[PDB]
């Protein structure tokens, strides 16, 4: 559970490591995706099968009113769960994490489309 | 009615983790912007659809 450059038996890759639910044959030392990407490895000391997750990343989106209207903005970390964003008001959605936004309950009419039913607006 | 949204981290996709590659990309130019300004157009057009 840290974003690292790993290497097992010379096999470099980038990600975070976790203990698998998957199970290898006795003699295999690398495992892959349907897209032929090392999705798994078996540590040549402990042999316990490790699944690899590539670190979470993406385009920061930014939500702004008119420059005329304000200098306030909310910063959106798309796809990323917010649990590693402080390594670089806050809320979480299927579409990403809204930082600098007051999460309200009242379902107003839409203006700034975000995803999975979410959209934003500027109000008191 | 619509097709799935996609975006790509064109820099991570063309040379993941490499600064030496990144300085080669910085000779190519606008191709990384362009190759998501196109996909933004698709992404918004799904919402409008």
């Amino acid at each position: 559970n840290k974003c690292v450059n790993f290497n097992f038996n010379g096999l470099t890759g980038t990600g975070v490591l976790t203990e698998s639910n998957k199970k290898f044959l006795p003699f295999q030392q690398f495992g892959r995706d349907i897209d032929d990407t090392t999705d798994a490895v078996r540590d040549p000391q402990t042999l316990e099968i490790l699944d690899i997750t590539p670190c979470s990343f993406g385009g920061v989106s930014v939500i702004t009113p008119g420059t005329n209207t304000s200098n306030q903005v909310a910063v959106l970390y798309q796809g990323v769960n917010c649990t590693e964003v402080p390594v670089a008001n806050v809320f979480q959605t299927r579409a990403g994490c809204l930082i600098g936004a007051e999460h309200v309950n009242n379902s107003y009419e839409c203006d700034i489309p975000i995803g999975a039913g979410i959209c934003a607006s500027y109000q008191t | 009615v619509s097709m799935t949204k996609t975006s790509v981290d064109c820099t991570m996709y063309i040379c993941g983790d490499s600064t030496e590659c990144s300085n080669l990309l910085l000779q190519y130019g606008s191709f990384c912007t362009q190759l998501n300004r196109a996909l933004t157009g698709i992404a918004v057009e799904q919402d409008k659809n």
Partner: peptide, 24 residues
Amino acid sequence: VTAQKFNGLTVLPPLLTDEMIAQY
């Protein structure tokens, strides 16, 4: 009919959920 990837393509979610279109 029948989340990042290592190279940084991303499937990205819809604006309206599959419930909200049903509600339309």
